[PDB]
Amino acid sequence: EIGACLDKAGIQNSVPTTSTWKADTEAWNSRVSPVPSAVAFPKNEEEVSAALKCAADGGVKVTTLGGNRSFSSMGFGRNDGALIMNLKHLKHLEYDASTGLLSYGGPVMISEAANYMWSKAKRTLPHGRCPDVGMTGVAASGFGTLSRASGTVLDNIESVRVALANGSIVDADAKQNSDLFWGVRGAASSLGVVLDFKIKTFDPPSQRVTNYTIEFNSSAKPTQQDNVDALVGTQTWALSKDNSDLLSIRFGLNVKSKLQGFFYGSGAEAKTVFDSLMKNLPPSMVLKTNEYDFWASEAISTPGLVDQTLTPRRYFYIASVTIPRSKPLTNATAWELFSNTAFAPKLVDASASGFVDIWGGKYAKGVKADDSAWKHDNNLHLVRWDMRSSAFDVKFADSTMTTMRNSFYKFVDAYKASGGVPGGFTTYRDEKWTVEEMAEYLYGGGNFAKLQKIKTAYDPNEVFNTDPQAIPAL
Numbered sequence: 001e002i003g004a005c006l007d008k009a010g011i012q013n014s015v016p017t018t019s020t021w022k023a024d025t026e027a028w029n030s031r032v033s034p035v036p037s038a039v040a041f042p043k044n045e046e047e048v049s050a051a052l053k054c055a056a057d058g059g060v061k062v063t064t065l066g067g068n069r070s071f072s073s074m075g076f077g078r079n080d081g082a083l084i085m086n087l088k089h090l091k092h093l094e095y096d097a098s099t100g101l102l103s104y105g106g107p108v109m110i111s112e113a114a115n116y117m118w119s120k121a122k123r124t125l126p127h128g129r130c131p132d133v134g135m136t137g138v139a140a141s142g143f144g145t146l147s148r149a150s151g152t153v154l155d156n157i158e159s160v161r162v163a164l165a166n167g168s169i170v171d172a173d174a175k176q177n178s179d180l181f182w183g184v185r186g187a188a189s190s191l192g193v194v195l196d197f198k199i200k201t202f203d204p205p206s207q208r209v210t211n212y213t214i215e216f217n218s219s220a221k222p223t224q225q226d227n228v229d230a231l232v233g234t235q236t237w238a239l240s241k242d243n244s245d246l247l248s249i250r251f252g253l254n255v256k257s258k259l260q261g262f263f264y265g266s267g268a269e270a271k272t273v274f275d276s277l278m279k280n281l282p283p284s285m286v287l288k289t290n291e292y293d294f295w296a297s298e299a300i301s302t303p304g305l306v307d308q309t310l311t312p313r314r315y316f317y318i319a320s321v322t323i324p325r326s327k328p329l330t331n332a333t334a335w336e337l338f339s340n341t342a343f344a345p346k347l348v349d350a351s352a353s354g355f356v357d358i359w360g361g362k363y364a365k366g367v368k369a370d371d372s373a374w375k376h377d378n379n380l381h382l383v384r385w386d387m388r389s390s391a392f393d394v395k396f397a398d399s400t401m402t403t404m405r406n407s408f409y410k411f412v413d414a415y416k417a418s419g420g421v422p423g424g425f426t427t428y429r430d431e432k433w434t435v436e437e438m439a440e441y442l443y444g445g446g447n448f449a450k451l452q453k454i455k456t457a458y459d460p461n462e463v464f465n466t467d468p469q470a471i472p473a474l
């Protein structure tokens with residue numbers, strides 16, 4: 001039926017009959033498998049509106065595909081029976097030297113954007129650390145090595161061009177369709193088919209880049225306390241006058257934790273930075289560094305960048321929260337994090353691992369709660385803990401993910417108990433959030449109500465409600 005309306009309009013489409021149905025509806029997380037009603041492949045903006053009319057006519061719900069690297073298979077549902085908007089014909093990358101803006105859309109990959117910007121203008125741009133993530137999907141937040149210095153991916157979106165539920169295609173930015181743009185910066189999937197993003201680009205912040213590892217020396221016998229002190233001390237440094245936003249810090253959460261990242265600088269500059277950080281750390285930890293040119297370092301931070309490499313599918317689950325600078329970790333809450341992650345009993349049939357990405361810095365201090373639908377003002381930490389099996393065709397029981405989830409939220413609850421009001425990270429959204437949880441974590445500070453108001457205005461028939469976490473209308 002939906003497939004017949006589409007065929008009527010001249011729109012290339014896949015339905016369960018089509019010989020390529022299986023390949024066209026394969027999501028990245030093998031644990032979450034939406035069966036959609038159809039996949040549309042519009043060739044221009046006319047076909048985008050014509051496909052949405054078919055869905056509106058039929059009552060079919062719509063979601064649109066980015067790079068198909070959702071940690072929770074969001075791009076295909078997750079509810080069954082949706083129309084999938086595959087924008088592969090609208091793929092583009094265009095750098096406007098007058099504005100410094102990169103314009104992009106369709107299933108454009110992080111690695112593709114970086115290689116273009118590099119060979120076009122020897123420039124960089126905010127991006128995550130997986131090469132095959134879609135730039136459109138990661139603009140729901142997006143944390144990279146330069147984010148302490150330059151903001152998240154979402155923070156650098158200057159405008160979008162959106163196809164709406166009734167076929168109108170509009171431009172939105174801070175000056176025009178401003179409430180829709182606000183909503184798109186955090187709830188894009190609930191609001192339109194976004195056909196174009198404009199992200200700000202940057203000259204590399206240094207010629208040379210020092211990548212580093214800080215870890216306990218091989219003879220140290222680190223306890224839980226030693227690990228806590230390394231985390232709290234890293235926090236102390238980031239909050240100190242010694243802090244540099246040119247230092248990315250991924251704090252690997254393990255019984256022998258370690259810090260890894262990149263300093264955008266060389267020579268004595270890095271040595272002064274590393275020195276003030278080490279002096280905040282347990283005395284048994286040791287620093288190791290290497291030095292590369294800027295572009296080579298990008299292939300280190302984003303492995304597989306230069307060959308635009310693909311990531312294997314995973315039987316996967318992630319839970320994540322942000323720590324706002326309004327409640328930094330205390331030794332007690334830092335302790336609860338370790339007890340529930342690295343020092344938790346191992347999972348019977350999955351590997352759990354993760355890190356605290358250190359956030360903070362000047363840019364985040366100047367993000368206001370209401371700058372976007374996604375509330376991300378003045379964050380200090382990004383906590384990620386995930387589980388995976390060894391192979392996409394190897395599963396772990398639901399009860400295993402339950403156990404892991406209850407442990408992580410024991411930490412979150414202790415953090416709350418300490419006074420903290422944890423936030424969320426859209427690209428690391430908890431697939432098991434209720435709406436109550438999704439609003440508190442992603443859309444706090446009264447953002448959610450304003451979000452519903454914008455939803456009710458721009459999609460009142462809930463065409464864009466393919467997921468239990470899609471924003472409901474009034």
Ligand SMILES: *c1c(C)c(C)cc2c1nc1c(=O)[nH]c(=O)nc-1n2C[C@H](O)[C@H](O)[C@H](O)COP(=O)(O)OP(=O)(O)OC[C@H]1O[C@@H](n2cnc3c(N)ncnc32)[C@H](O)[C@@H]1O
Nearest residue numbers: 066067068069070071074075128129130134137143194427
């Ligand atoms: C590394 C790896 C290996 C994976 C699988 C994910 C990673 C990652 N590294 C990350 C990192 O360093 N930093 C991050 O912040 N996130 C990282 N992620 C997670 C990744 O950012 C997210 O999973 C993100 O959702 C990926 O986006 P995607 O490739 O576009 O995935 P989908 O195609 O499934 O879309 C995601 C979500 O957004 C909606 N969407 C996409 N494109 C849209 C347009 N044009 N208009 C409207 N809505 C759009 C999808 O419908 C879906 O809800």
Ligand SMILES: *[C@H]1O[C@H](CO)[C@@H](O)[C@H](O)[C@@H]1O
Nearest residue numbers: 001002036037060081082
């Ligand atoms: C999408 O459309 C298909 C074909 O009409 C249905 O079978 C499905 O249940 C969903 O409504």
